[PDB]
């Protein structure tokens, strides 16, 4: 007989057991984990969906190259010049003849920039862009902007004298379709090699987008994110699988609200809320055969058939403070007005399938394919399909409603029972024994976590509850069975724990209301996280400051000088060193032009007084200034992605670490430390496995200062506990690993405390190790002499297990 007190928090749990007889504190700890939140999954999904757009643009130009080769227009895609004007060529091909190469250039430029296709201030500017499109093409608009304002792409605010109006470069894609059709038609009048199948294939490359319910994939690709599946099944609409299940039969699909059976069930469940069998049949036939009614005519008809005034009518639904409401059919009557197909006599189940097909799909192609693939031996007519898609597009506030929580099986079991008995659906369900609503999974001793995590409120509460469930499982493993469990959505885990202890016949009362404080953390060992930052930098070779030879510096750039932040950046670089600008070393005349409004007056005031700051020339015709480059710092740790025909190194910076491998050698008696990063692993070249090869690992072992006669001690991940001990004074302290910092300095390690999340700076570690830095980060050198290092594995309850050698070779294959 003990008692388990368990505190559930946002990013931690904390437990303690008490004896209930004497009253001593037997065991206490806290488990710390990151609070599970979905700003990481948003970033993952955003990047997954943007990579597909870059993929599909590249595949559009690949398909255009295959089209121009497969029709015999040009042969080698090496001699094509990249310095012709595409907009002038689009207008010239709109009226005169082009050869093959200029045609390829213009059509390639159009395929690279097609338009939007869904049709506040943005909608106004897009409507203004469409306003000039009834007699002009996009080519003429963009060429007029190019010849007049000297600037085409982006979005910019050229100043007209009357007013300042902002232009933009988005057009509807039907304009691109008309422009390409006219160009290809005049070229078809001149060139005989352009056939009409070529025209239609180009227009399908140009304006061809997948539907939003089709997803990625192909017939032979078999992804698991769209229609074609890895189980060999092709799904007509991807969202169909996503429909929930019935509330009493967990293997049947939920029923559509616009069916016949659901509307019958709803009208009959509202009528029995207020009658004989014949009166109910008469009311159903009346609302089924007459047109243009609401609640008022129906309540007058119930008053007329029962020979009673409309008062003392017991229960009906009401929307707000005003009028009442009741279920009419309202979709059967609006389906009755369809002229091409007859609906009075079809079936019961065809009405259900027709309501399913109209509820799921909104586009005409999905409705057409579902009618062809769900009504086998139905043999519909083409005009019926056109009237059906017109009817679906007509009143979509009625068909786009949702799915009624029952299924057609249960509503066929329940509909002939509430004709005779005057009772409701719940009492018939309790009478019939249809009370099976379980999610059962059987163990024999412990608690299941996938059972308890069946209801999704937030990811954070699910994370905390399953951490607490692992705590409880290991705690009742270690200290036998318990008697009382006091924990801190709440009624959900309460009901689940009561059901678990009542099913296994264990009488236990669960309720929802120092130096030896152990801790245990969650070790982080996933191996494909974000490898670096996402800005691509450019490097130059220079001599800045106290420097004697040419060295590689990383460039930085001030994007807009006029803005306040540009002035702060320019002022800091100006007061530190003036020669750090590239314009100060290639053009000093423009730089004294820059010193003049600094000395007289800041750049915003000059822009209001005279416009943009121009580059100095002998006349007033030079270009203007909006941005400036400078030499930021030297080049350190990077990933070199320099292109093939470049001449300066182009890099990615700030690359993130993954794990460390601790070695020891019996020649000098000191410990040595590897550092692996996320960018050190690789999809291997034959099969595609994600691992680190062995020759590359020996290169990192050479580089990080580890001799080859050293035994391998253990491996360390993030939040993995670590024991550092002195060997002459025998004082010890245990830490949390974080990373291997500063790759220039050998055997430097950043450590985090064992008792809190942050050091906050200043306190005293072991005498050999030193004092924590004044700013807050502890990064110390563990590759010293006279020291010893052990690994600490702690179980979920927090009992230490100190290890010295944990294997024979590092684990590189997963």
């Amino acid at each position: 007989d003990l008692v388990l007190g368990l505190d559930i928090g946002i990013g931690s749990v904390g437990v303690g057991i008490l004896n209930k007889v004497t009253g001593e504190i037997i065991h206490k700890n806290s488990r710390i984990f990151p609070a599970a939140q979905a700003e990481n999954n948003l970033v993952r999904r955003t990047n997954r969906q943007g990579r597909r757009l870059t993929r599909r643009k590249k595949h559009r130009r690949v398909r255009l190259n295959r089209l121009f080769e497969e029709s015999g227009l040009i042969t080698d895609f090496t001699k094509i010049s990249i310095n012709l004007n595409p907009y002038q060529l689009r207008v010239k091909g709109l009226t005169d003849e082009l050869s093959n190469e200029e045609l390829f250039i213009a059509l390639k430029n159009m395929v690279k920039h097609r338009g939007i296709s869904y049709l506040g201030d943005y909608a106004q500017i897009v409507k203004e862009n469409s306003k000039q499109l009834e007699t002009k093409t996009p080519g003429q608009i963009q060429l007029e902007r190019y010849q007049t304002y000297g600037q085409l792409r982006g979005d910019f605010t050229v100043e007209k004298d009357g007013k300042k109006h902002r232009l933009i470069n988005v057009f509807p894609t039907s304009a691109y379709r008309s422009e390409a059709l006219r160009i290809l038609q005049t070229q078809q009048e001149f060139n005989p090699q352009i056939t009409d199948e070529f025209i239609n294939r180009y227009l399908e490359i140009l304006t061809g987008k997948r539907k939003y319910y089709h997803g990625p994939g192909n017939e032979k690709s078999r992804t698991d994110y769209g229609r074609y599946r890895t189980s060999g099944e092709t799904l007509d609409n991807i969202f169909g699988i996503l429909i929930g299940k019935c509330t009493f039969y967990p293997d049947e699909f939920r029923a559509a609200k616009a069916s016949y059976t659901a509307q019958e069930f709803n009208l009959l469940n509202d009528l029995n809320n207020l009658l004989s069998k014949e009166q109910k049949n008469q009311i159903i036939n009346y609302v089924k055969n007459e047109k243009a009614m609401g609640p008022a005519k129906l309540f007058k008809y119930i008053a007329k058939l029962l020979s009673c005034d409309v008062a003392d009518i017991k229960g009906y639904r009401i929307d707000k403070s005003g009028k009442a409401e009741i279920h009419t059919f309202e979709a059967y009557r609006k389906m009755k007005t369809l002229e091409t197909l007859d609906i009075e006599q079809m079936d019961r189940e065809t009405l259900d399938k027709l309501a399913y097909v109209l509820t799921l799909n909104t586009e005409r192609e999905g409705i057409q394919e579902a009618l062809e693939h769900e009504f086998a031996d139905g043999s519909f007519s083409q005009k019926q399909v056109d009237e059906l898609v017109q009817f679906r597009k007509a009143n979509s506030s009625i068909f786009g409603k949702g799915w009624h929580n029952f299924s057609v099986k249960l509503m066929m079991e329940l509909i002939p029972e509430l004709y005779e008995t005057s009772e409701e659906q719940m009492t018939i369900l309790t009478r019939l024994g249809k009370q099976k609503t379980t999610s059962s999974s059987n163990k024999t001793k412990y608690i299941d976590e996938k059972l308890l995590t069946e209801e999704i409120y937030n990811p954070v509460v699910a994370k905390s509850v399953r951490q607490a469930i692992k705590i409880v499982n290991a705690a009742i493993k270690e200290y036998g069975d318990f008697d009382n469990i006091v924990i801190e959505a709440s009624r959900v885990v309460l009901n689940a724990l009561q059901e678990h202890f009542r099913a296994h016949k264990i009488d236990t009362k669960v309720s929802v209301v120092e130096d030896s404080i152990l801790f245990s953390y969650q070790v982080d060992s996933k191996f494909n996280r974000k490898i670096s930052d996402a800005t691509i930098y450019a490097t130059r070779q220079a001599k800045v400051g106290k420097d004697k030879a040419d060295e590689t510096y990383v460039l930085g750039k001030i994007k807009d000088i006029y803005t306040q932040d540009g002035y702060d950046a320019f002022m800091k670089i100006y007061k530190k060193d003036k020669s750090k600008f590239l314009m100060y070393r290639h053009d000093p005349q423009t730089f004294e032009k820059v010193i003049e409004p600094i000395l007289e007056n800041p750049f915003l005031k000059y822009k209001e007084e005279h416009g943009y700051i121009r580059k100095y020339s002998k006349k007033g015709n030079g270009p203007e200034i909006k941005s400036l480059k400078y030499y930021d710092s030297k080049l350190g740790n990077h990933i070199d992605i320099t292109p093939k025909d470049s001449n300066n190194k182009v890099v990615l910076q700030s690359v993130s670490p993954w794990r460390a491998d601790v070695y020891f050698n019996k020649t000098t008696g000191k410990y040595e430390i590897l550092g692996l990063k996320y960018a050190d692993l690789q999809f291997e070249k034959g099969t595609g496995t994600y691992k680190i090869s062995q020759e590359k690992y020996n290169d990192i072992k050479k580089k990080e200062g580890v001799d080859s006669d050293s035994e391998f001690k253990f491996t360390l991940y993030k939040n993995d506990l670590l024991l550092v001990k002195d060997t002459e004074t025998k004082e010890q302290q245990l830490f949390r690993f974080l990373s291997r910092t500063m790759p220039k300095q050998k055997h430097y390690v950043e450590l985090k405390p064992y008792d809190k999340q942050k050091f906050e700076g200043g306190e005293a570690l072991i005498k050999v190790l030193g004092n924590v830095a004044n700013s807050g980060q502890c990064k110390k050198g563990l590759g010293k002499s006279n020291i010893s290092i052990y690994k600490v594995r702690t179980d979920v309850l927090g009992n230490q297990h100190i290890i010295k050698n944990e294997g024979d070779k590092p684990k590189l294959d997963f």
Partner: protein, 183 residues
């Protein structure tokens, strides 16, 4: 293999081939030159016959693959005989001709096993160079952990701005077209 001035010319040629700047190759952990001694080594001052065995072997091991070291040995054996080749061209051009015709024999006999990949090379600053060379290997001679027993490296010198495609079919299609562009 035996060591003379031709090995110095071959080392300098492949060092200029794989590395953008010179300082990377001569500060690696195992070579470890200084600046004055590197200027003496490049100008023919120091003779590569009486240097340290470990330093010369580390310079040879960083630049070449191990099957390529076996091909250095066989090349030297075939080249110091038959002195029209010793009259005509220098040793690195003959080494390139030897390994290129070995690749042609690989592509002729067994075209189902030739796989390829991108090759990342570590410099002396701690960093690596993504896409430093193009590596080619035989799948059937595959030791465990991803090492391969038969393997060669090449450096493509094509002029167009389009990279080498991934996939087995596409990469092996690319190698057969641009044979005289890879060096």
């Amino acid at each position: 293999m035996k060591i003379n001035d031709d090995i110095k010319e071959l080392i300098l040629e492949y060092m200029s081939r794989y590395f953008k700047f010179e300082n990377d190759f001569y500060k690696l952990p195992g070579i470890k030159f200084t600046d004055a001694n590197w200027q003496k080594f490049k100008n023919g001052g120091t003779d590569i016959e009486k240097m340290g065995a470990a330093r010369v072997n580390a310079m040879l091991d960083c630049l070449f693959d191990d099957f390529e070291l076996a091909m250095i040995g066989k090349a030297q054996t075939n080249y110091y005989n038959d002195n029209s080749l010793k009259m005509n061209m220098p040793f690195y051009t003959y080494y390139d001709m030897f390994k290129k015709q070995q690749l042609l024999k690989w592509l002729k006999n067994n075209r189902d096993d030739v796989i390829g990949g991108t090759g990342r090379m570590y410099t002396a600053s701690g960093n690596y160079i993504a896409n430093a060379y193009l590596e080619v290997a035989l799948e059937s001679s595959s030791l465990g952990s991803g090492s391969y027993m038969l393997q060669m490296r090449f450096k493509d010198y094509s002029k167009g701005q389009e990279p080498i495609p991934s996939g087995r079919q596409n990469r092996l299609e690319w190698i057969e077209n641009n044979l005289e562009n890879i060096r």
